[PDB]
Amino acid sequence: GTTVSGYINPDFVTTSTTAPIVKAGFTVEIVGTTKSAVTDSNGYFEIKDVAAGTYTVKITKANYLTREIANVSVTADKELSTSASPILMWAGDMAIGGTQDGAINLEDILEICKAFNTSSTDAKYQVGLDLNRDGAISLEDVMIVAKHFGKVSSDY
Amino acid sequence: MESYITMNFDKNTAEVGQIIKATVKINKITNFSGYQVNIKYDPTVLQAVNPKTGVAYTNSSLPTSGELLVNEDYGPIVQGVHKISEGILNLSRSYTALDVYRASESPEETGTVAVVGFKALQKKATTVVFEHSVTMPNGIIGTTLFNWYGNRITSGYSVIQPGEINSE
């Protein structure tokens, strides 16, 4: 049928070195189908052979707040977003006890603070807590979570 | 830059056993929401202590609060992760409920943010500075300041190092 494409970006400032790591790995699902795709280092995704119809599109990534986009109407090839105006995803719904709870709150902050003020060579450092992937767990990572403190998935 | 972060001492002389209060202060930092600073001192000359009680800092001791960052409505959090054997302190305090903070239309931009104590172990000339850390990738001479949108302030302020202690 059709191709559904677009761009996903994390909601925080990146650099040339960090962008290709943090923009990749978002899974975009067309709910109601078994069709998905993972974003590349430019944040770009492409899902082919999509049947015409109206869908919810769901976006997920470890340690990010899951997003749902309702009423995505597909009648032909469709671009959901652009490189200059991407869909933003909010980091800081952390895997705690091997599960995310769909809220960004104090527990998510406390999870990062378990390895506060470390860099990648430290044994205590965990790459998952380094939200902006700059090779350190510092106040920047904590403030990223604070951007959307007290929010849940329906607030997107 | 008339916007700055600095450290000020209540006094720059000290007999053995006396405590110098070192206050971290900011001036005209727009929509300021938090700091992190990395400080280097000489641990054989100065001992990091609580500025009111004189109790020795451990590697998890927290900085004493100043004028700013103490409105409980914005959910402040504070951290201390040091290497006292190397004379390194790392201090951080910030607001978490940034949307509430913005809604007040009342930014904190100038004033004191932290106080640490230094007890003289020796009466001997010594230097305290803000210092680069690998744990703070984009630090500006060992400092990272943030605004109330949760973004790092990447330019427009000076880091003013304090004067010498016990110079003669």
Ligand SMILES: [Ca+2]
């Ligand atoms: Ca959570």
Ligand SMILES: [Ca+2]
């Ligand atoms: Ca980081």
